[PDB]
């Protein structure tokens, strides 16, 4: 069983926890709304191979976290999350990517750009603008909704596949 260390990053309120919880939930607990950074596990079959995903749900750069740098050093792939109704969260993406490049000292870190809250009509970030940004980084772009579950599995499994193809 191959293990993968994934890190979910992005501005406050974009849905980092909602995404993580939606992927890892075994549903015993009805509602889980995390208030703190934490690590979660999910065993899943991706392309025949049993994988163990360790998913770290991180705080936005606005919050202090002592272990942030070691989180990046450890992390093997990164979900870079913004919300399609929050232009500022989208502009903030450059900060998340620079931090990862600075800590890991590499241009070629596995990453997926994630446009969350795609269930909402009040869109301020056009899909094509986010496609252009991902293309400039050389990474996949996937839109997700943590409410409907749309794209949630696809975003994490694409990140895994990015790690493998690295
Ligand atoms: N409509 C909609 N709301 C969402 C979606 N994902 C999360 N939310 C909502 O957006 C808010 C923030 O979600 P949350 O998961 O806490 O985001 P976060 O990035 O972990 N926040 P924090 O940085 O403070 O930890 C919550 O009210 C949550 O229910 C989504 O896909 N669609
Ligand atoms: Mg959170």
UniProtKB/Swiss-Prot annotation:
A motif (Effector region) lies at residues 32-40. GTP binds at residues 13-18, 29-35, 59-60, 116-119, 145-147. The gene is HRAS. It catalyses: GTP + H2O = GDP + phosphate + H(+). Changing residue 38 to N: No effect on interaction with PLCE1. The keyword Protein biosynthesis does not apply. PANTHER family: RAS, DI-RAS, AND RHEB FAMILY MEMBERS OF SMALL GTPASE SUPERFAMILY. It is a lipid-anchor. Keywords: Acetylation, Cell membrane, Cytoplasm, Disease variant, Glycoprotein, Golgi apparatus, GTP-binding, Hydrolase, Isopeptide bond, Lipoprotein, Membrane, Methylation, Nucleotide-binding, Nucleus, Palmitate, Prenylation, Proto-oncogene, S-nitrosylation, Ubl conjugation. This is GTPase HRas. InterPro entries: P-loop_NTPase, Small_GTP-bd, Small_GTPase, Small_GTPase_Ras-type. Glycans are attached at residue 35. It holds the Pfam family Ras.
